[PDB]
């Protein structure tokens, strides 16, 4: 809604305080972690399946904390 | 300083073509929105309009679109509303007004005036209207002139050459049949009526009839 | 679209005395960009407050607008003589641009009773076959009045021509004409000729009258 | 006007070859230009200031549910007319009501209602376009004279002394010649046009305040909008909501006031403030400064006679050069000040250079102020003032030793070249050569790769630097650094440029 | 006819017909019209080279009025450049865009 | 949705003249489903045609129904004094049901006067403090008439009440009856009292007054 889809960046010339600027600092994380961590049923399950597929190790940790992030918000 | 300057205010026929100047003064013509407000006679200001000074856009209210030309002369700095087909709804005082912009318009041309109506100069029809028994008041003798049948206004209308300036009440001149009466009533003491002339001098420039009718007794 | 009424329509006032006149955005949240715009009779309008906030520079701190984005006050604390006027308020935050229905500053005072004096059509008229009857009522405050032309008892409302003064410069009061214009033809068909006038000084019409008939 | 006290101070270095200079110059920054035969000036923009700007559409972020009217038909009765539908002002809505013979119908199971709530705004909000003709720059332009804390400091002062000036270009005035009174005149020829894109944006109020906003992003807005002028709106519904049906009764809800929202909305969206016009502090633009007419006084004057004393002490500015303004003793002024910037007393050899080239006594007035900055070295020093007895010096240091300079100006070269896109290469000024095909070669490139995925913001392109760096980790060589090119910078640099 | 000896000012601000050139009309305070009108298509003031091509060639004041508006074209030519109309003193000049 | 009208609204006729009484249908092509509805004064509604195109079976051949769709028309060629009757016409191709202003048939005939009689308020009413002045303005044809009340003079519209019959069975004419109603104050304040009345048989007013200062 209005919240969402916000028009940071805006990025034209603009070196310069944004309207609202520190706001962007945490938004990704913390409430996707805040999600997860309010679920952390949620979060053990979703990441041993990172370990299941694709047997090729260090890709197969990649999966999960997307997918972490991906659950939370959609 | 800055100052909104326009043309004088115009007697006009329905069916004509007026166009109002705006002339910019003591500001940077281009910057600020030049805007375009509708006082009627009656009514109070209704805004028309405003026409973009950078590019010399337009922009009228849903109301004044299609009738009124806006128009910006850019050297000169002056500003333009262009009415057509005058109307006599276009009889009205007209106001430029230099945006402030979100912050509105600060402020106005001297005002402009427009008449949109038929009628032809006319004089005045100027009657001493005497008081009778109980038209005396007090020590007072209220007198009258009624300023009858004249296009268009004003008239000038004094009393003793205006040396009857208080007990004086010349009333407002008003549209009758496009002509206008007014009846202007002094307010003299009975012991200087009729014992002093008590004379309605009543000056029509625009007919250029100059009428003076002392009230007698009746 | 967006509507602003400025209330009162009028306040009687003494000067140096506190009318705040009223204000209201009917639509969004106008928040700033609403004005004051001082025009007295026969002039271009003059700009007061801006952001509905902020004093013009001409202006001085005596005027103040108040309230904020749906609902505003034009305060004058101390009002003047000076300050006597038609203000209005405009919404700038959208075009169209437009202005409320004003509030008039009256300079309150005594209430003064219509000099009331009704005049017959001059015999200057009557010879042009026009028959006027002029009717004076003079020096009233308030403004509130009323003209009622009576005809033979029957009160004729047709031909009434009024024309009245605004407040009285010296007494601040208010002066009127009520003119009758008859046909000589009915002038003469008709005899008592009564104007009344009714005024807030007065619980009755002040009745201002000539039968023909007499002189 | 001046860089005086300016956060960002930057020191433009004449290096001859045009009296004319190209110069990328803002409202944040002050450029400070030191060149050969000319005193030292200073640009910078005072403001971005559009004058005059045109309302694109408006918005209804707070909506007002208002009469909610729902007229019911029976099972069957299938479409439900509620007159309202002629007014837009109403919001109705179809739908129905399942009925038994308890509630109005002979039948049971299904129904028809027509809800018509009338719509009203609570609370809307606007955008509007700059005219790129109304678009004004207010550039601060001064030179560095005989000059005190205050004169320096208050422009009214620097106007008299000629070593100031403010001005304003547009596409159509795009060059200003402007004169320094005894030090003759000087000209900037500018970009007014190409200082922003007018129509990259809009300016969006929301409140009494106004935003910058993306005018491709500012139709994005889903939301009750508006004709630019006045009424008839479109999702007006969006910000009011429906109910069950219970019997004939459904209900429309306004939203809670969306207005957080809209500021929650603006991220990257600059404060604009409308006072006659917007005035944007953010600067771009690209004038050229012409030094030609520019002149010296003080070639004449000889050495000031008199004893030289600190009005304020050695101190930085915070770029890297020592500020003082001395009393001077001597009312031989008008007279050319005797200074240096030295290393020791051992030796009378400058090490430095002079900020405020011409250092000179103003007026005959003794003990006169007079502040001037000067560039101290690396490492300690003294400044020699004067030669002679009547020479005052102060000890001074300067912790920036030389290598640290070529490495921050090296990884400020990322940090120039980021954020300024094509335009990182205007650095070259009077270019050719590599900083010819520089551009040319970031021309398309920034105009590609970058902007091409655009539309990512920190973790998001933040995040590809490892999964990309992955890839480059397990491929194959002559593939691994092509495969690397979209890894580092571009993507790194600006994810690693925001820490923080 | 000799170059317009004054003056110009923008009639019209620089329009780009969306075709690729770009007409300006000229109020020219010059009443030495009849006259040819000084103009070009210039890259930057410091070079007086014509950098576009005029589209109406030989643009003419047709009469002595003074701040008679003249509406004249030519072509801009790719990225940034200027419109220097007139010379000197009497140069006004308009920085115009083609981004093509 | 869809309207009608149904011209003419009345129509005075000689009774086996032929006078078709039009009707069109505003919207959509009303196709068949229109259907003609003689109402005399008091009835419920006679349907009269069916498809606008067919009789019913209650109703005689003179009747002809006609047009299509977007037009139709009632047809009696032979009028008659039972055809005198209040004519509908409904689209029903659309609910809603609707009719159009209907068409009168009504029986021509020579012009007559109002037989225009004044009757000031009885002792009877003058004893109960309420004055009317009765005016019965009896068998004029057309129905066409306008009453006035005049009082000293001057015009009195009210307390002005008015009756009339409808075309009357035998001479076919109308009778009126203009009614003023007065306040036995001012029924007393004023004297000359008058029922004019300018009917289509005369160029002018027919007065019919008295004074109460008459008899």
């Known amino acids: 809604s209005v919240s969402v889809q916000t028009h940071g960046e805006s990025s034209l010339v603009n070196k310069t305080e944004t309207w609202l600027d520190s706001t962007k600092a945490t938004r990704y994380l913390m409430k996707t972690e805040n999600w997860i961590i309010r679920n952390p049923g949620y979060a053990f399950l979703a990441a041993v399946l990172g370990w299941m597929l694709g047997s090729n190790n260090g890709q197969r940790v990649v999966f999960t904390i997307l997918l972490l992030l991906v659950a939370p918000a959609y | 300083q800055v100052q909104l300057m326009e043309s004088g205010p115009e007697l006009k026929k329905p069916g004509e073509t007026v166009k109002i100047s705006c002339k910019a003064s003591?500001?940077?013509?281009?910057?600020?929105?030049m805007h375009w407000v509708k006082q009627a006679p009656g009514k109070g200001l209704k805004w028309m309009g405003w026409?973009?000074?950078?590019?010399?856009?337009?922009t009228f209210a849903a109301d004044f679109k299609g009738r009124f030309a806006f128009s910006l002369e850019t050297s000169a700095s002056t500003a333009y509303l262009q009415i057509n087909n005058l109307k006599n709804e276009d009889t009205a005082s007209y106001f430029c007004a230099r945006g402030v912009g979100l912050y509105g318009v600060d402020y106005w041309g001297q005002g402009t005036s427009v008449t949109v109506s038929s009628p032809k100069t006319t004089p005045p029809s100027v009657y001493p209207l005497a008081p009778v028994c109980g038209d005396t008041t007090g020590s007072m003798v209220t007198l009258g002139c009624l300023v009858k049948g004249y296009f268009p206004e004003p008239v000038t209308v004094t009393w003793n050459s205006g040396s009857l300036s208080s007990g004086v009440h010349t009333f407002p001149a008003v549209l009758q049949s496009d002509l206008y009466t007014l009846s202007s009533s002094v307010t003299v003491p009975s012991s200087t009526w009729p014992s002093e002339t008590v004379t309605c001098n009543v000056a029509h420039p625009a007919s250029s009839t100059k009428v003076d009718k002392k009230i007698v007794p009746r | 679209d967006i509507v602003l009424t400025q209330s009162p329509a009028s306040l009687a006032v003494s000067l140096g005395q506190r009318a705040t006149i009223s204000c209201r955005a009917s639509q969004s949240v106008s928040t700033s960009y609403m004005h004051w715009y001082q025009q007295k009779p026969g002039q271009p309008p003059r700009l007061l407050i801006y952001l509905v906030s902020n004093l013009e520079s001409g202006v001085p701190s005596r005027f103040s607008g108040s309230g904020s984005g749906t609902d505003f006050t034009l305060n004058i604390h101390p009002v003047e003589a000076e300050d006597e006027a038609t203000y209005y308020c405009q919404h700038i935050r959208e075009l169209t641009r437009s202005e409320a229905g004003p509030s008039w500053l009256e300079i309150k005072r005594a209430d003064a009773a219509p000099t009331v004096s009704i005049f017959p059509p001059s015999s200057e008229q009557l010879t042009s076959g026009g028959a006027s009857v002029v009717c004076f009522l003079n020096n009233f405050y308030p403004k509130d009045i009323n003209v009622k032309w009576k005809i033979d008892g029957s009160e004729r409302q047709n031909g009434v021509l009024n024309s009245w003064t605004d407040q009285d410069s010296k007494d601040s009061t208010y002066s009127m004409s009520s003119t009758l214009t008859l046909t000589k033809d009915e002038y003469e068909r008709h005899n008592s000729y009564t104007c009344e006038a009714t005024h807030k000084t007065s619980t009755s019409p002040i009745v201002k009258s000539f039968n023909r008939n007499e002189c | 006007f001046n860089c005086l006290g300016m956060g960002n101070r930057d020191f433009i270095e004449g290096a001859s070859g045009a009296t004319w200079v190209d110069l990328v110059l803002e409202g944040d920054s002050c450029l400070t230009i030191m060149a050969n035969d000319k005193p030292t000036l200073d640009v910078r923009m005072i403001n971005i200031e559009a004058s005059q700007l045109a309302e694109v559409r408006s918005y209804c972020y707070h909506a007002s549910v208002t009469d909610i009217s729902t007229v019911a038909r029976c099972p069957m009765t299938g479409e439900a007319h509620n007159e309202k539908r002629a007014d837009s002002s109403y919001v109705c809505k179809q739908g129905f009501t399942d009925r038994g013979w308890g509630n109005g119908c002979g039948l049971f199971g299904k129904g028809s209602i027509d809800t018509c709530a009338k719509f009203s705004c609570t609370s809307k909000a606007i955008g509007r376009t700059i005219q790129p003709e109304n678009i004004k720059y207010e550039v601060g332009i001064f030179v560095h004279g005989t000059t005190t804390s205050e004169n320096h400091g208050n422009y009214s002062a620097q106007v008299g002394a000629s070593q100031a000036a403010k001005f304003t270009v547009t596409p159509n005035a795009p060059s200003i010649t402007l004169k320094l009174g005894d030090y003759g005149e000087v000209t900037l020829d500018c970009e007014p046009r190409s200082g922003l894109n007018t129509e990259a944006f809009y300016v969006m109020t929301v409140g009494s305040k106004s935003f910058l906003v993306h005018r491709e992003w500012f139709h994005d807005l889903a939301l009750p909008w508006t004709p630019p002028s006045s009424t008839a709106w479109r999702n007006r519904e969006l910000l009011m909501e429906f109910e069950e049906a219970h019997a004939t009764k459904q209900s429309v809800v306004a939203l809670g006031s969306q207005e957080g929202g809209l500021h929650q909305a603006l991220a990257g969206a600059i404060v604009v403030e409308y006072s006659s016009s917007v005035k944007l502090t953010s600067g771009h633009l690209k004038c050229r400064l012409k030094m030609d007419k520019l002149a010296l006084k003080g070639t004449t004057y000889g050495m000031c006679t008199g004893k030289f004393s600190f009005a304020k002490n050695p101190a930085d500015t915070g770029h890297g050069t020592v500020v003082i303004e001395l009393s001077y003793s001597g009312s031989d002024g008008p007279c050319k000040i005797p200074i240096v910037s030295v290393a020791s007393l051992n030796d009378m050899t400058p090490v430095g250079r002079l900020v405020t080239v011409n250092p000179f006594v103003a007026t005959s007035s003794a003990n006169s102020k007079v502040l001037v900055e000067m560039e101290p070295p690396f490492g300690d020093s003294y400044i020699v003032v004067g030669r002679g007895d009547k020479q005052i010096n102060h000890h001074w240091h300067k912790a920036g030793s030389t290598l640290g300079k070529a490495f921050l100006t090296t990884l400020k070269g990322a940090q120039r070249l980021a954020a300024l896109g094509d335009t990182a290469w205007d650095f070259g000024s009077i270019g050719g050569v590599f900083n010819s095909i520089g551009k040319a070669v970031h021309q398309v490139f920034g105009g590609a790769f970058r902007t091409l995925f655009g539309g990512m913001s920190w973790i998001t392109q933040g995040l590809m630097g490892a999964l990309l760096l992955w890839m480059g980790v397990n491929a194959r060589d002559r593939s691994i650094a092509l495969a690397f090119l979209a890894t580092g910078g571009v993507l790194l640099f600006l994810a690693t440029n925001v820490h923080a | 006819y000799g170059m317009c000896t004054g003056k110009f000012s923008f009639a019209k601000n620089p329009a780009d017909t969306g075709h690729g050139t770009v007409v300006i009309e000229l109020s020219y305070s010059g009443s030495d019209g009849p006259c040819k009108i000084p103009i070009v298509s210039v890259a930057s003031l410091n070079d007086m080279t014509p950098v576009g091509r005029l589209v109406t060639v030989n643009p003419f004041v047709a009469t002595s009025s003074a701040n008679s508006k003249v509406l004249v074209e030519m072509e801009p030519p790719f990225g940034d450049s200027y419109i220097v109309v007139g010379r000197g003193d009497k140069q006004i000049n308009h920085h115009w865009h083609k981004a093509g | 949705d869809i309207v009608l009208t149904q011209s003419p609204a009345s129509l005075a006729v000689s009774l086996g003249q032929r006078a078709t009484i039009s009707c069109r249908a505003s919207q959509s092509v009303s196709t068949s489903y229109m259907h003609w509805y003689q109402q005399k004064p008091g009835q419920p509604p006679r349907l009269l045609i069916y498809l606008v195109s067919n009789l019913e079976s209650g109703v005689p051949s003179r009747f002809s129904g006609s047009g299509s769709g977007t037009d139709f028309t009632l047809n009696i060629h032979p009028v008659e004094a039972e055809d005198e009757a209040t004519y509908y016409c409904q689209h029903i191709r659309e609910l809603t049901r609707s009719e159009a202003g209907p068409s009168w048939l009504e029986i021509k005939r020579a012009d007559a006067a109002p037989t225009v009689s004044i009757f000031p308020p009885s002792s009877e009413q003058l004893t109960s403090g309420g004055a009317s002045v009765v005016c019965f303005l009896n068998n004029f044809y057309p129905k066409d008439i306008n009453v006035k009340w005049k009082i000293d003079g001057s015009e009195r519209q009210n307390g002005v009440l008015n009756s009339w019959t409808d075309q009357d069975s035998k001479d076919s004419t109308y009778s009126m009856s203009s009614t003023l109603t007065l306040t036995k104050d001012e029924y007393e304040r004023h004297n000359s009292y008058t029922c004019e009345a300018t009917h289509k048989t005369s160029t002018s007013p027919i007065v019919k007054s008295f004074n109460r200062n008459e008899c």
């Open positions: 003591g500001y940077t013509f281009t910057d600020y929105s």
């Open positions: 026409i973009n000074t950078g590019t010399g856009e337009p």
